[PDB]
Amino acid sequence: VVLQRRDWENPGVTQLNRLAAHPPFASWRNSEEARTDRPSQQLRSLNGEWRFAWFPAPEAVPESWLECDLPEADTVVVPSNWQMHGYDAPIYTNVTYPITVNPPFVPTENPTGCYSLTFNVDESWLQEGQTRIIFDGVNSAFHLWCNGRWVGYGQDSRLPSEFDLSAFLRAGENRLAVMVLRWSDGSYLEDQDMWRMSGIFRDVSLLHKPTTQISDFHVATRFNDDFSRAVLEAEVQMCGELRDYLRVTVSLWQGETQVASGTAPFGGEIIDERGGYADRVTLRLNVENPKLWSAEIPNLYRAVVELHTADGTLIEAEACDVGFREVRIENGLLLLNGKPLLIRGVNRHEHHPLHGQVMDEQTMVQDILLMKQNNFNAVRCSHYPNHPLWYTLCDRYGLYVVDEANIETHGMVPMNRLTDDPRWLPAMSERVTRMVQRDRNHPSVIIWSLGTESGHGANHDALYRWIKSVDPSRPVQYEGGGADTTATDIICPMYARVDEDQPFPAVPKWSIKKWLSLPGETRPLILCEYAHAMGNSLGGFAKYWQAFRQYPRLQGGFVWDWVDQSLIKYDENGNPWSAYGGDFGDTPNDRQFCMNGLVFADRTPHPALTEAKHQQQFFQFRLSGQTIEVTSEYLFRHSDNELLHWMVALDGKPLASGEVPLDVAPQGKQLIELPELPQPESAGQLWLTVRVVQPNATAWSEAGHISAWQQWRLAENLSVTLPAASHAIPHLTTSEMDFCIELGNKRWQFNRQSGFLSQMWIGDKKQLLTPLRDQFTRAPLDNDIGVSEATRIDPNAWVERWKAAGHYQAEAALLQCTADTLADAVLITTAHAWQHQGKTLFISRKTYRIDGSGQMAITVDVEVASDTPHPARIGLNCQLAQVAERVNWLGLGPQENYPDRLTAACFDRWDLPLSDMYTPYVFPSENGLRCGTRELNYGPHQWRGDFQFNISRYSQQQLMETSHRHLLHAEEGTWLNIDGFHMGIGGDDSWSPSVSAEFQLSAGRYHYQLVWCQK
Amino acid sequence: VVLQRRDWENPGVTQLNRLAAHPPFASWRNSEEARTDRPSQQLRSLNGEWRFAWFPAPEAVPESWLECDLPEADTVVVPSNWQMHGYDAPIYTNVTYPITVNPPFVPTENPTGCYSLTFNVDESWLQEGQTRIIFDGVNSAFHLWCNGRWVGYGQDSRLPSEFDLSAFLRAGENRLAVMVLRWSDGSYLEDQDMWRMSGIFRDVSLLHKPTTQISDFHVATRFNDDFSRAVLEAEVQMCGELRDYLRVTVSLWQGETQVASGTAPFGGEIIDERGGYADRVTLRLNVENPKLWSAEIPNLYRAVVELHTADGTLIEAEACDVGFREVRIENGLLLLNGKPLLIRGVNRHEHHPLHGQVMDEQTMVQDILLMKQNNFNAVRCSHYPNHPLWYTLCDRYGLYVVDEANIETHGMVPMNRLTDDPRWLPAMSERVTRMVQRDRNHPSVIIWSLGTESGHGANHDALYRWIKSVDPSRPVQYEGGGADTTATDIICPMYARVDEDQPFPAVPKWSIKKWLSLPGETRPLILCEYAHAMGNSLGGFAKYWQAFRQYPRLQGGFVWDWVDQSLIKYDENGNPWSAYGGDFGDTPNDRQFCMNGLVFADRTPHPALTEAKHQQQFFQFRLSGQTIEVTSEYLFRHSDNELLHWMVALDGKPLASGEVPLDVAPQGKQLIELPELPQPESAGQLWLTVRVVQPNATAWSEAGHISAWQQWRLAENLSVTLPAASHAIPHLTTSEMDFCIELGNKRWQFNRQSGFLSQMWIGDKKQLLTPLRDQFTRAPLDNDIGVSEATRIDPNAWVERWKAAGHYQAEAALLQCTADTLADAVLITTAHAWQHQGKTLFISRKTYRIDGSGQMAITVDVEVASDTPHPARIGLNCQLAQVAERVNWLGLGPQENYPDRLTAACFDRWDLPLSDMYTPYVFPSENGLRCGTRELNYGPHQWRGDFQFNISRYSQQQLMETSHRHLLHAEEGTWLNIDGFHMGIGGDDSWSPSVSAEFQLSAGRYHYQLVWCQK
């Protein structure tokens, strides 16, 4: 019958014989074990070694398999995705569905996973009560057999499916058989931008409950106006036979102290003309001066729910963690415990590079620590309900959660083709309701979300009202259909810009500042997705946070996203490398669009991460005279684990420094008086750096953790002294093909046909492998490329503007090249013009001055044609012969920084190994820049001026021709790029031009100067 | 798989392979036929003779039935209910489920109907296009096979279920097999107070459409401030292969005149980031000064939707009737076309005494004509979507409709057990959504309803918002959970009273005047059920209408209900009788509670109908001197078919009459002067009577139809003349046992032991069969009985208060009986005491004065113990010897009227046959009373005074002992009851006391006088 019905091609059938959803159960038979959240004997794990066989379709599955293990089958770990074991390929597609769009049908070649397990069941579990099996995650649909008999069917990859096995088991050995289909009618609602995989990827377990049992329970907390009194309200439901002797007790614990308690018989209030719920009871407990829950201080109580007899004999007990907090919207502001929130959030998919989409505790804890260490306070479950342990961990560590239902239909045309169709309402409702029924008691969950990218349909409206009706404690949001529909309490756009309107038809993304004050609008605005962190990204990030602070109704957003979705492949010699879309034969695919993280697959930080930490600081600073003003952005806590370190330095050289304790109230101010500063000996700029240090370790950080910092310029003494004139005078040697200059053990050569410095000698040794030439291009970033491909060009992306304008193909034509001997120097003058098909793009005019002391002063003036696309950079490059261990500079650092992403960097003297001067982005591009530099040292070379640079073993050319980082090979010597000017990187999104006007190189005339010498 | 799946015990499966729901289609291939609504060749009826066999379960059905006709099966007529043909019993239950409550399961003994049909299909339908089958109604679930192969499955008994037969049909003979189950998981949502039947009870048809087709269309009409401009908006959706040459044209017609037109290609406006619906188009037509639709004047246009090509080739045509009207709630008022409605409504089930739940045109038309003739302007579809033809007739004749979803869970405990469970959301949503998708283009449908008596659950909220999202042109209403929840735009209580609060816990029925002004309340109030019309009922009906008129926000209600649900059975002689609950072996049952109508099952009126007509009049009246002031309650029309008849009479005798045209604007007044009336000579009371008459016939009434009336007392001249002094004197004859009085041929006898008038003689004929005695009781009405039964007594009911107090068993004790001889008369004086168990209930003191003219003046004074329950009446009864043909009276008439139901009756001189003085209620009770009577004539007898009376061949004893009207037999002679005072009949409901305080007999001391003579 099962192969005849094809329930996996019927959106009217989403389960068969499946049990009702509920909060996490353990069925404790002792109240103390429940209180302390220790393991339960009534909850067994079935994870471990199972039997597995792969089939191309469900028609290919032999009928013997229902009763006998297949000898052809293998032994594999569960939980797992079968693509991670090599049985078939994982696919990466973004918008376009991985199957033909023909609802409700799927392909006839539908890969099939046959899992089986032989296991023991104890006699005690069968004599009394109810034994159930629980599958936490099966992708995407499945049929279940026990001892050869059919049990039932289930869909939705991301929520538990449970079945009663009481009538099916025997004492001793038992056999489970699970048939997992890769594709089903459920797939039409699971079109998230991620790897498409399948199998049993979350926990399997077995739970024993009594016959008379707790079948559901709800906890609520409401408050008086000043939060000095609370009422905890708990509604409990039972199953089994109803008797007068039955009782529930809900008791509230704080550590080992019981603070409140209530006991009552079953039989709720009268509800209508037919009475009340005889199988339900409500308990109300008064709590005076409750400790409140927030992400700043995650205060938790333990609630224990006991079903028992009047006389006091336990039947069973459940329990959960309780956080006393209020979430409400008033006067256009989202409030937590009466104060306006500021969301420092991120989006987080469940991803591991080795295990695929299987989640474990070690990884989850690793993620939460990094988040909190980097000033984040909120997370979005993009875009499905998470592993149940996630919520418990957020409750305990302190993070605000947006729990989101497993619905995305991005690939339909138009986007709401299913979500407006009443025949898809049943399948949709189950994905929203079963989420709310499971997670409604977690305090970390503050907002419900209806899914993502499914346009706006009437089904969203019904399900919105359903949530508001069953759970008034929490606001509901939904971005689809323009981000401000009747199905959202919060304006929640994706990738809307700070100042810039993007007036798309029907679904415009307004500037967030403008969006608030549209006629009739009153709601708060929090971006569900912003600052697309693909590759070298996060430009313009400070612009959001400046707006967030100034505008009360702008309350933050969630960065896209946390972690790169790369996977590990192995080569011939057995070495691992990071792979993205296409790398498995998967076609069509969306290549590297699956890598948008602030961290790599293995949780190493991208440079963008430090920019997020600095801008998301909790302390704000102002300087007046000798006075630092410190302001706190905390809403509830004092600065009880904070001190201020201050230091003053003269061009990197330390002069004075000290410490002061921080004692600031939430929203308060503290004025710190700096002592009399000693007077500086010499020329240079004085800088002040402050940083907030945490002396004591926490649950989430180490002793000495740095949480905030800020810099200021102090007094400047400009250099007014002439370097006393030297004895020596440089000598010029004119040839037809070269101008050569000599001074002691140093030699310079200017080629008279190319017009550039072709070689330079210290003593006798060659310093250059390539001539010193102008450069107006960069190895293109992901933001520069957008969705542009070889076979389908988008002419609007920056890379295509540059290609079509000939910027990459342009050839330097020499206009002028003269030499003159002066009293104490030699002066070389050059001029070049870069042309493409008869159009002059660039003109570069230079003078090189070599004086008696071996210093070379280079002066550059560039003209750029007003009607060419603004250049990526204006600077110089060369390949040095020398390979040295260390790079030393006086400028912004120590990490990678660009003009629109440099606020986190500080001015000082930095020193790193060469390999650190390279950011290993999986898709290679321009990387490693440092800005605002006054001095650079590498080997015996020193450059001075006011410039930006990168230094590495990889040419811009290798970087732009190579697609995977592991395919790069180090070149002879070190490629040096020194720019007078560099274009911003943008990243408000990664599919259209996103570099803001004030970071484009549009001035038409540019000037910079540099001194090159030996040290 | 069909027997193994058991899809009828699974609320997660409500259909298999069923096509989407849609507005009435006919697939016309000629535009002129679509416009004129003439028959289509592409829509065949399959109604007529089919084959049928009955089984006790689906397991008992032979497999040969799929392949071949069963020799044992009978030929029967479809549509029908198989209970109406005798195959099993119909069941009457009100609240309690007809099956054991154990969701989702049904009994293993499940009466199965096996239907089959052999039919031919036109050759062309096989070559190309799509052939579907439509079942408008199947009760309650079914499986379908064509030519032995399985097609699909269907639930919901009240909306059409459609299937594609294209891959199934063949040349020549085809056979349909339809397996119909009585019970399903669908029955849990179908617990309406009604007979429970089964089968194929609505139409069956075949529809042939092109492969490229119209699959959906919506029509909407919106207006400017004063309705002088309209825009008609029509959205159209297609199925099949998209071609650039395709087009849609929507044209609007009034008769043969095209008023507006619009044409466009497919491809709607951009909706989201993925574009728009390429398979859809939206047309907008301008209409200046549109004829507006209302129930007063049902102005209709015709819209024709053509799917064609660019060069003018038609593919197919659909169509509908369009009414230009706006429905909105503003400032707490329900407005139609800017004006506040006053709903004169009624609930109506689909019921026929012979054919059960099968509807036909003739019965439908008959129903509508009788409603309009009685001043009803609105109907409620209790409690499911009706036969499609009903909405077409309502559009055309003009009645406001409340379309109701087929959801009632009355029998659950608590009432919302299912409707609050997310696992019942899918089954529920299909009942709401598929109603709306079908009926949204009907103009007569002004309000959507979510069902009835299912409590208030979160599923109601979700479906409330769904309707408001897809159709904002109509308010949504729902009564469950207290009548004023968040799932209704209208306060819509059932049986809430005018002045009296009933503060039930959780779900109080506040008095309707009070309900309006509760703190925070702003909504309009229209009762969804009021004035329960069970048996002798509708007392206090005037009180509702007075308040409807004084309070702008009380906008009317729907009477419960239209027609008695009695069925026809046949006895031993084959003579018909009216049957109710229990008479088919059906048990448990709710007896006569299925009979609640204003009309009998055959559409003969109850007396209550005329009271509805009068209180619901559209013209109000005031008299001031010679001035009659007429006011119109019409909102839209002038009195263009209305004249006023006036007449003045002196104690029934005509003195003057006239006619005046009526020309009153909507909400207008008109003053009409009376000519000065000729002076009346003799004593008496003058009465003015006015009626409004329609001189011309309409679509719903004949010429001469009376639509409104009113009466006033004018001048009274009190009688002062002495009667003619008679010359004879009455003689007394005493014995120990009797006082006899004699005058001429006349003779009176008084029993000195009982104390009553025991016999009277006119010459030598006895006039009495039973002595003249006080009576304080009545054969209890349904309102008297309530839910009280022999096996479960309700002590609070009036009949039980009377039974327990001994009213029915009280025996008369004689206290005093004397005779005196005066100058010209004989005086008899009596005193009686009625006692029960040593307690005195009533005392009656009488005098009888028999004088020289032969007249007998009876004076009566009664005491009623304040602590006894107030009596049903204070009067006299006796059984007269004579049986006569006519009854003639001066008083309120001509129909049955009671003290709290007599506003419709007029004071005049009435003359009827004796049988019209008896109302044949199916469950017999007190009936046929007439109030305000000053003179009664019957045979040679005449009674003068100021009394209430009823006259018949049936004693109060027989009426109370007999349960069915057909089991009554005429008694010898005639039973007369003459009351001085009679209690009200009540009727606000029929399950608690409902007679208002001022219509109960509580004065304690009563007085009345009669004169009995032979005229």
Ligand SMILES: [Mg+2]
């Ligand atoms: Mg399915």
Ligand SMILES: [Mg+2]
């Ligand atoms: Mg997407």
Ligand SMILES: [Mg+2]
């Ligand atoms: Mg079913």
Ligand SMILES: [Mg+2]
């Ligand atoms: Mg009911």
Ligand code: NA
């Ligand atoms: Na803000």
Ligand code: NA
């Ligand atoms: Na992505």
Ligand code: NA
């Ligand atoms: Na590259």
Ligand code: NA
């Ligand atoms: Na009113």
Ligand code: NA
């Ligand atoms: Na009834």
Ligand code: NA
């Ligand atoms: Na009776």
